[PDB]
């Protein structure tokens, strides 16, 4: 009969009793659908997730929505599997909640469509790739000074108004154009107005046709705010496995995911750990991140925005998050005013892939030389600021001359910016970027004005622009 009965309702925690020998498994999804039998009842459509077996055929669950109106003794039905979310082509260009139901106004998905469980074991050690590969993003600064690894995690740092959404849209566009792979955006604990603004930006940028969007509203219960990330990840896993392509995955804020997990643990009554976090923080983060890997017939790479509580990098949540990251990109407000539209800090950004064994000896040498030149300019800046210019030596003058050219050449024109500027976008291969930066370091284009190196793309655009303007 697999029919349960509600016996306890305490906020977002609901306890259900089943007939003996027919209890649902852990992480299963239970449905409650009730119709008002009289004037002292309300309609209810609620979904629960099994968490514990308390004994005496009783199961403790966490609600996915409001529990108001629940009555002890209401019928509960077990679906026999964890939460199932539709996958496939039907999810492209759509907006979903944690339950997998569409949020936008274009209609419901047919009930016969394929659905996949939210909870799934991580891929086996047998299936993983045996080598490290570079994901060519087409952005000069990223491809040069902080390469991306297929199947790796990239930490994104920055505030508002610095270009985070523009960078995200450009990454999605470039990946879809040059690799045929779609991207997935997962909003965890975001602000609703900001989510709507991002939706409209992706709509009018022409990018939304190649992405699937999942939002966990900030007013949603902690269970939803915790399972939204898994919903997005299992949306992306279908395209990793069946279509065999390289897929992106964006997380709005993973710290809010950890906070939702902590709230769920506090509600469940487990004893707290560390600075008040759940004892299972490390294993929850591992279960989330270990499914983002590069297998033999695909790869999922994730760009995650990270919030540091109280600016403390030793806090348990950022400390656990950082143990999974493979790269880091920092967006700089100073560069934002200076006019470098990508605004990626060339010195703060770091990547594990910047090694000779991975990117090549020539690439490593060029990157190291560029970083050293930028650093040297950084120290010289105060000398130019306080002392006279004549105090600079000949080599210092040459370094100052080269550094501005390099810094302006790190900028790039994006396809997304076309709707606001007019000029088309450009996709720059990594080898072309390396060749251009090596030529700049050689002094092959010293005579060109520093303004000729702004928003060009490849190196030939610099000389073409210089000839056009003079």
């Amino acid at each position: 009969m697999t029919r349960g009965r509600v016996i306890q309702v305490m906020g977002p925690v609901v306890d259900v009793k089943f007939e003996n020998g027919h209890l649902p498994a852990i992480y299963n999804a239970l449905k409650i659908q009730h119709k008002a039998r009289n004037e002292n009842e309300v309609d209810i459509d609620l979904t629960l997730e099994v968490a514990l077996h308390l004994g005496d055929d009783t199961v403790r669950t966490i609600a996915m929505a409001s529990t108001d109106g629940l009555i002890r003794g209401m019928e509960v039905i077990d679906t026999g599997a964890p939460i199932s979310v539709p996958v496939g082509e039907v999810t492209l260009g759509r907006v979903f909640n944690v339950l997998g139901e569409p949020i936008d106004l274009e209609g419901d998905i047919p009930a016969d469509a394929r659905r996949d469980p939210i909870h799934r074991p991580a891929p086996k050690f047998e299936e993983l790739a045996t080598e490290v590969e570079i994901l060519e993003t087409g952005i000069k600064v990223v491809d040069l000074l902080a390469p991306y690894i297929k199947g790796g995690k990239i930490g994104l740092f920055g505030g508002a108004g610095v270009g985070k959404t523009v960078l995200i849209q450009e990454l999605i566009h470039n990946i879809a154009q040059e690799h045929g792979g779609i991207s997935v955006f997962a909003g965890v604990g975001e602000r609703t107005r900001e989510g709507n603004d991002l939706y409209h930006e992706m709509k009018d940028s022409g990018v939304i046709s190649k992405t699937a969007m999942v939002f966990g509203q900030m007013n949603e219960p902690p269970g939803a705010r915790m399972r939204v990330a898994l919903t997005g990840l299992t949306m992306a896993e279908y395209f990793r496995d069946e279509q065999g392509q390289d897929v992106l995955l964006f997380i709005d804020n993973i710290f809010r995911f950890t906070q939702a997990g902590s709230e769920v643990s506090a509600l469940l009554g487990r004893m707290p750990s560390a600075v008040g976090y759940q004892p299972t923080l490390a294993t929850e983060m591992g279960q989330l991140q270990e499914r983002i890997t590069s297998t033999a017939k695909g790869s999922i790479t994730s760009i995650q925005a990270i919030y540091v509580p109280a600016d403390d990098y030793t806090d348990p949540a950022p400390a656990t998050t950082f143990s999974h990251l493979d790269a880091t990109t920092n967006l700089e407000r100073k560069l934002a005013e200076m006019g470098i539209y990508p605004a990626v800090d060339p010195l703060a950004s770091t990547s594990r892939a910047l090694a000779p064994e991975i990117v090549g000896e020539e690439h490593y040498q060029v990157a190291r030389k560029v970083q050293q030149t930028l650093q040297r300019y950084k120290e010289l800046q105060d000398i130019i600021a306080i002392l006279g210019m004549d105090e600079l030596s000949d080599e210092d003058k040459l370094v100052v001359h080269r550094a501005r050219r390099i810094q302006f050449f790190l900028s790039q024109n994006f396809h997304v910016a076309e709707q606001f500027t007019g000029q088309p976008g450009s996709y720059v291969p990594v080898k072309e970027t390396v060749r251009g930066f090596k030529e700049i370091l050689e002094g092959k284009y010293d005579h060109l004005p520093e303004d000729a190196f702004r928003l060009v793309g490849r190196i030939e655009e610099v000389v073409e622009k210089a000839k056009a303007m003079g």
Binding site: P272, A274, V275
Partner: protein, 56 residues
């Protein structure tokens, strides 16, 4: 006398700049310990509250 006055002013400027740099380094080294103590205090408080709740 004029040369001595100029030298005195330059020396005072340099000394003050060095003092500011040292103060900033001390400030950051103290902020690290402040963060550690904050974490320890939060952990102790939450542990005491949970133990008191469990005692009932």
């Amino acid at each position: 006398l004029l040369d001595a006055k100029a030298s005195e002013h330059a020396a005072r400027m340099t000394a003050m700049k060095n003092a500011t740099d040292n103060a900033n380094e001390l400030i950051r080294t103290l902020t690290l310990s402040y963060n550690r103590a904050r974490q320890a205090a939060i952990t102790q408080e939450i542990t005491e509250i949970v133990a008191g709740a469990n005692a009932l």
